[PDB]
Amino acid sequence: HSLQPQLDCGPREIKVKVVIAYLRDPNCSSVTSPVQASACRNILERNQTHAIYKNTLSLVNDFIIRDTILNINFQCAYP
Amino acid sequence: GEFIVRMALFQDQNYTNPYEGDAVELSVESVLYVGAILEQGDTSRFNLVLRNCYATPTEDKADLVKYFIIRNSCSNQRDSTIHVEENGQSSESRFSVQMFMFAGHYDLVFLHCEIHLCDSLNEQCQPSC
Amino acid sequence: LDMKVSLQAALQPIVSSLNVSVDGN
Ligand SMILES: *[C@@H]1O[C@H](CO)[C@@H](O)[C@H](O)[C@H]1NC(C)=O
Ligand SMILES: *[C@@H]1O[C@H](CO)[C@@H](O)[C@H](O)[C@H]1NC(C)=O
Ligand SMILES: *[C@@H]1O[C@H](CO)[C@@H](O)[C@H](O)[C@H]1NC(C)=O
Known part of the structure; x- marks a missing residue:
């Protein structure tokens, strides 16, 4: 399986295109996310001489769900 | 006084040998019987x-969002699988839903109910719908 | 005649699905 989720790290917005979707923190529900690490719970991992913004978007058919979620774990590796 | 009413969770459509009940783990596809x-x-x-x-999805009964299960005294719509088996006449009222868990990030689902004590003498309040 | 009743347990599902991962610069 593969979706080819188009992730397009910008200078101020992380944007991931691929039902309601939401980031780790319940808002940012439309998919965009500000690059500010204090916004919708973006994970910061500064491995040496780089900085990656990891996040786990989730797609669910209805706000109640039955046996099917879409846990898209996308990261942005900035210089 | 108080007519203390209780409600438990049974494991099967079989209405006995139920769960003792501390914190139940269920398949989202599975079924529980309260x-x-x-x-x-x-x-x-x-x-x-x-x-x-x-x-x-909160111990408190006053939340912004909440699953209906059954509104207006019987048989909430919008749910594919709901069965109020014997709510009403008997001192025991039973209904069945498929497991679920809400949007956002919390795996904690709780059940709350409002119960009205009809009487079966010259009071035709069988819950009709 | 209209008391409120609650279930004394937590309903913990085992919802799980297809993990995905991607990269970007
Ligand atoms: C999420 O947005 C709702 C408005 O829909 C607001 O009530 C709530 O405080 C927000 N929560 C966070 C963590 O931003
Ligand atoms: C950190 O991870 C990125 C991911 O592509 C990689 O390019 C980089 O080499 C890693 N840093 C180190 C020090 O290995
Ligand atoms: C079903 O019937 C009774 C009560 O419903 C129970 O004692 C019996 O063990 C059950 N049989 C099963 C679950 O196979």
């Missing part, structure tokens, strides 16, 4: 209707 019982009460003529059994 029945409101009028234990420790009149039970000779007082029925037990199921008016507003509902669900919410």
Whole structure:
């Protein structure tokens, strides 16, 4: 399986295109996310001489769900 | 006084040998069987209707979002699999829902209900719908 | 005649699905 989720790290917005979707923190529900690490719970991992913004978007058919979620774990590796 | 009403969780459509109940783990596809019982009460003529059994992702009964389970005294719509088996006449009222868990990030689903104690003497309040 | 009743347990599902991962610069 593969979706080819188009992730397009910008200078101020992380944007991931691929039902309601939401980031780790319940808002940012439309998919965009500000690059500010204090916004919708973006994970910061500064491995040496780089900085990656990891996040786990989730797609669910209805706000109640039955046996099917879409846990898209996308990261942005900035210089 | 207080007509203390209790409700438990049974494991099967089989309405006995239920779960003891501390924190139940279920397949989202699976089914659970909760029945409101009028234990420790009149039970000779007082029925037990199921008016507003509902669900919410918080111990508190006052949440912004909450699952309906059954509104307006019976059989909430919008749910594919709902069965109020014997709510109403008997001192035991039973209904079945498929497991679920809400939007956002919290795996904590709770069940809350509102119960009105009908009587079966010259009071035709069988819950009709 | 209109008391409120709650279930004394937590309903913990085992919802799980297809993990995905991607990269970007
Ligand atoms: C999420 O947005 C709702 C408005 O829909 C607001 O009530 C709530 O405080 C927000 N929560 C966070 C963590 O931003
Ligand atoms: C950190 O991870 C990125 C991911 O592509 C990689 O390019 C980089 O080499 C890693 N840093 C180190 C020090 O290995
Ligand atoms: C079903 O019937 C009774 C009560 O419903 C129970 O004692 C019996 O063990 C059950 N049989 C099963 C679950 O196979």
